[PDB]
């Protein structure tokens, strides 16, 4: 009854009021590019990778945050949308370090993959890059903060999901730095999940460091026995060896998180 009508590339779709442009695209099987947006975190709207053209609107909107209005035609593949993605990806990679061979994220990196699928194929940045100092937040999460793209997923997860207010940004402008400011360890029981939600290799697992690459792991979907919650997990193995433990999405149990002990 309350459902309004919108269009994705001219295809009609019925959505509830308050649905975002990103969620309307989800219905027809389109996945808008993203970095800051996470469906289990509060909306941020800062990476600007989800910019999409609305037909007849001169300005692209941030799909992750903009609520759809009745009758909108979202153009997910327009020349305007495609140029917005290339421009934003260009800004993301301008100061990003050439770390992929030594970066544990390589091969399962959303920055690599969305650069392949939505960015340009070359650079025109001719300057020196930003370099940021690293920060210790305990024995579980290694931080290479030069790789951070300031998506603020970790900050939002810690505040909303883990209920811990230690992470935040300091400074402003290009020198805005995600961290704790003071020397502090982020030692929650849910801390290890910030590795998963960080789209880049800025936050990675210290125990897992350097040991494998994503393509070569075999994925075994199993269950955790560290407690009685029954968290669903993926056991990554390679050549007969357990390499790491990853969450497996189950809406009715662990959603997409696992405890540190489980991890």
């Amino acid at each position: 009854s309350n459902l309004i009508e919108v269009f994705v590339d001219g295809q009609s779709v019925m959505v509830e009021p308050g649905t975002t442009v990103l969620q309307a695209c989800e219905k027809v099987g389109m996945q808008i590019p993203r970095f800051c947006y996470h469906e289990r975190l509060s909306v941020a709207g800062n990476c600007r990778m989800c910019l999409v053209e609305i037909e007849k609107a001169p300005k692209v909107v941030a799909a992750c945050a903009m609520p759809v209005m009745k009758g909108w035609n979202i153009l997910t593949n327009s020349e305007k949308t495609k140029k917005a993605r290339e421009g934003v990806m260009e800004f993301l990679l301008a100061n990003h370090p050439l770390d992929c061979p030594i970066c544990d994220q390589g091969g399962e990196c959303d920055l690599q993959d969305q650069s392949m699928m939505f960015g340009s194929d070359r650079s025109r940045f001719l300057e020196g890059k930003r370099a940021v100092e690293d920060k210790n937040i305990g024995p579980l999460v290694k931080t290479i903060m030069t790789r951070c793209i300031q998506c603020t997923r970790c900050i939002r997860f810690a505040s909303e999901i883990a209920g811990v207010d230690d992470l935040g940004t300091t400074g402003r402008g290009n020198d805005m730095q995600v961290g704790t400011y003071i020397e502090k360890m982020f030692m929650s029981e849910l801390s290890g999940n910030i590795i998963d939600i960080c789209p880049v290799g800025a936050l990675t697992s210290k125990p897992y460091a350097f040991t494998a690459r994503p393509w070569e792991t075999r994925k075994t979907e199993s269950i955790d026995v560290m407690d009685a919650v029954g968290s669903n997990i993926v056991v990554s193995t390679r050549t007969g060896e357990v390499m790491r433990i990853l969450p497996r999405m189950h809406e009715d149990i662990n959603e997409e998180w696992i405890s540190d002990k489980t991890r």
């Binding site: 770390d99 030594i102 370099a131 030069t146």
Partner: protein
């Protein structure tokens, strides 16, 4: 430095050495254990630390296009040195 275990078998730079009672060392009987004696961990520690003037320095490993991808190293932490993640050279901000 290459070490010899109490069984006399050389220890590799990866720490591998058949323990006493491992039949697999019979493969070396009448032959030899191929061991590289230029331990890279030792060689890189002999390099002097390079003092620089800026807060950020870049390393491509030397030789331009014959080195490694160019990276940038922050030198704000004065307790430790900035190390190149590719080649292991160390850098220090002079005062």
């Amino acid at each position: 430095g290459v070490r010899t275990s109490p069984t006399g078998e050389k220890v590799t730079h990866t720490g591998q050495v058949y323990d006493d009672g491992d039949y697999r060392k019979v493969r070396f009987v009448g032959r030899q254990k191929e061991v590289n004696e230029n331990f890279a961990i030792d060689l890189i520690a002999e390099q002097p630390v390079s003092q620089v003037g800026s807060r950020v320095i870049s390393c491509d490993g030397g030789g331009g296009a014959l080195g490694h991808p160019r990276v940038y190293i922050n030198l704000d932490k004065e307790t430790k040195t900035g190390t190149c993640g590719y080649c292991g050279l160390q850098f220090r901000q002079q005062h």
